[model samples]
Target chain A: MIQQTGYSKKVMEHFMNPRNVGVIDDPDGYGKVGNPVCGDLMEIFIKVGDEKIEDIKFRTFGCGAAIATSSMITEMARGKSLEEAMRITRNDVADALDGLPPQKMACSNLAADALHAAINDYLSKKQ
Target chain B: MIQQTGYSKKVMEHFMNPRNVGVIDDPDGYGKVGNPVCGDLMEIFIKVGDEKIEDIKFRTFGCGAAIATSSMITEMARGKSLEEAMRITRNDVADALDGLPPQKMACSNLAADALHAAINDYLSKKQ
Candidate 1:
C-alpha cells in the first residue's frame, strides 16, 4: 500500500515490497538509470540461463514511480528471451502497471532502461 | 540556454552539455536510481583510480532539474577520495548546481548514488 499516492493496487504492491531488489553475482547484464522534473534512480542486474533470463535483480532509490517501475520491469522481463526483453518499452511497463500516472510518463522510466541496458551490457560483453 | 524551461542558467549549462556520462570500465561501484510524480532519468558511471574517483560519467534523459543534477554530481565526485565521495548527498549536488529544483529534489540527485554505489560495489568486491 503506497502512502497518499493514487497508484493502482499492482503498482502499490510493487512499491511496498519491490521485486528483485539487490545485487547480482557476475551478472550477465547490468544497467543503472535516473530521471528528474523528475528524479528517480534504479539499477537492474540479469543472470541468463539457457539463453533466457533466469534471474533479475534491482537496486532502486527514490519513491512512487521509481520503485513500482523497477518492480514491474523485472516482472515483465523475467523468463523472457534476451533478444525479446530488449523490446520492452516504457509504454509497455506503464500499461502493465495498470494505469500509471501522467506525470510519470516522462522518459524517466528507469525500469525499461534498466532492462534494455542490462541486455545490451550482456550482448556487448559477449561480443 | 535551456529550451523553454524555468531552470537556472547554471542548470541550463549543466543540462546543455552534461559531464561524466557513460559506463565504468570494471567499475568499483555502481548505482541506478529514478523518480516520478512528476519527472527525469540519469545513469552515472565511475572508475576508481588508485583508490580515488578516477573517472565519472552520466547519461541523463529528460528536462530541467534532471540534467543539471546529473552534471553537478559528477563534478562533485570526480576527483575525490573514495571515503569522502561516499559521504555525498543529494543536498550537496543541488547546492553545487547553485540550487536544484524541487521536482528533481527527491532523494534522487541520482548523481551521488552513482558515485557511492560504484564505490560500494568496489568495496564489496574487495571484501
Candidate 2:
C-alpha cells in the first residue's frame, strides 16, 4: 500500500525539501515534543534577540507532516516578535500550507506548540 | 527544490508499510545513530532468546531511506541467530532492496550498523 498522506503541493514540497531543518547549538530557547500516537518527535530552537525572534530552526523525527510543519513554522516565526510568534497556532500552520490532512493536523501542529513552549522557556529564565 | 532520494519499490514499500515499527518495552539491546549530513536518525531494538533474535523493531526520524533500512533490517534480523544477523551488512541491505541510489547508501546503511551495535550491547551485558 502506498499509504498516501493526501498532502498539498506545499506539504510535499516541505517533506521532500524542508527549510530550516537543522539545529543551533546553545540556542536561547529550545522546545522538543513527541507524539505518542505516531512516535514523531520535534525540537525547535529559537534564537531570541532584542525581543525579536532572530532565527528559528528545527529538527524532526517522523513522517512527511512532521517535517513540513516544523519547516513551515520556522519560516513563519523567523524575524517576528516573540508576541507575534506566540500567536501563530497549529491551525494557522495548516492554513498557511493550505491545511494538512485532517488526521495529520494534530501531529504536525505540535511544532507550533513547541515553539510556544520554547519562547516561554526563554522568557521564564530571563527574569 | 526537492531533494529526491529516488528509492526503489522494495525501499518505498518497506518505508510506507513498515513492519515491527514500535519498540519493545524493555528490549535486551538497543542502538541509536544519527546522520549529521542528512539529519536522519535511527533506533533499533532487539529481544534475544537462546542466542537468537526472538524479535526486532525500530524507530526512525528521517526520510524514506532511513525508515526503509530500519524496517528491512528488523525483518532480516528477526528470528536469526546473533552471528548470522551480524553478517547482514549495508551491501546486503541495499541488495535485498535491489540497491539504493549511491548517495543514500551511506546514511541508510547506519541502521544495520546500529543493529549490530544493539546486538553487541546485548551480548556484552549477558557475559
Candidate 3:
C-alpha cells in the first residue's frame, strides 16, 4: 500500500490536457533543452509583435511535471513583453502549478529556461 | 484551463514514494531499458532463491508514471516464482495501477519488460 503525492490539482490539470501543445510554423524563435539525466526534453516556439510575445507554444517529452510546467510557462509568458517573459522564473512556474515534488523541481526549472532561450533567440535575430 | 488525468490514486501513491527504490549490491540479475523518444530509463535488480524471486528493486529516471510503474512491478514480482513473475504482463501492471494515460501506456509496458529481462538474466547466469 502507498499514499500521498505532492502534485497539486493544477499540476494534474495542465499535465493531462496542456493548453498550448503544438509547434508554431515559421516561428520567430525556437528553443530546446534536455535533461540528459532525467531524459526530459522541452521545446518552445514563439512569435513576437512589438517586443511582446504575440503567440507561444511548447512540446515536452518527459514526465507529468515536465509537461505541466511547460504548459504553465507558455501560458505565463504569452502576451507579455520579452523582458517580462524573461522574468518568469522557474519558481514562478512551480508556484503557478501550486507545487511540484522535490525530485521534479528540475523539470519546472527546465521549462523556464526553455522559454527564456526562445525569447533570447528572438532578441538575437532582431539585432 | 485543463482537467482530468488518467493516473489513478495507486499510481500517484507509488510515484510519490515508490517502494524498492535502490540498487542491490552484487545482485543476482540486472536489467536496464531506456526510451530514447520519451527519455525514460529504468533499471531492475533481483535476487533469486529456490526458483523464486526472493527480492527485487528498481530505479527509474523519468516521469511520475515511469517511477510508479517501476515500483509497482517490483512489488508484484517479489516473492513470486520466477516463472509466475515472468508471466506478469504489461496490462497487469497498468491494471494494477488502475490505468495509465494513453500517452504513458508505453511506460507501463517497459516496466514489465524490464522485470522479465531481469528474470531472463538470472536464468542465463544460472545455466
Ranking by TM-score: 3, 2, 1
- TM-score of chain B as predicted in candidate 3: 0.88
In model 1 chain B, the worst 10-residue window by lDDT is B99-108
lDDT of 3 by residue, B1-127 (tens): 2544455778767775688987888989888887665555688999999999888988655676777788788888989999899998666765655545455666777777888889899989989
Over 4 Å off in model 1, which ranges? A1-5, A96-100, B1-127
Query: In candidate 3, residue A76 scores what lDDT?
Result: 81
Q: What is the Cα-based lDDT of residue A54 in candidate 2?
A: 92
* Model 2: per-residue Cα lDDT over A18-120, one tens digit each: 7897788899999888766544467899999999999888876456677777787888899999999999876675554554445566667778988998999
Q: Each model: TM-score of chain B?
A: 0.77, 0.87, 0.88
- State iRMS for model 2: 10.0
Q: Who wins the TM-score comparison?
A: 3
**Candidate 2 chain A, poorest ten consecutive residues by summed lDDT:** A94-103
What would the per-residue lDDT of candidate 3 be over residues A18-81, giving only the tens digit for each residue?
A: 8888789999998888776555568899999999999998875467778778888888898999
Cα lDDT tens digits, model 1, B17-48, are: 56665566665666666555443445566777
- The 10-residue segment with the lowest total lDDT in model 2 chain B: B94-103
Each model's lDDT: 0.67, 0.76, 0.77
1 versus 3: better DockQ goes to: 3
For candidate 3, give the DockQ: 0.16
Q: Which sequence of candidate numbers ranks them by DockQ, best first?
A: 3, 1, 2
Score residue B119 of candidate 1 by CA lDDT.
77
| Superposed Cα deviation of residue A127, candidate 2 (Å) | 1.6
Candidate number of the best DockQ: 3
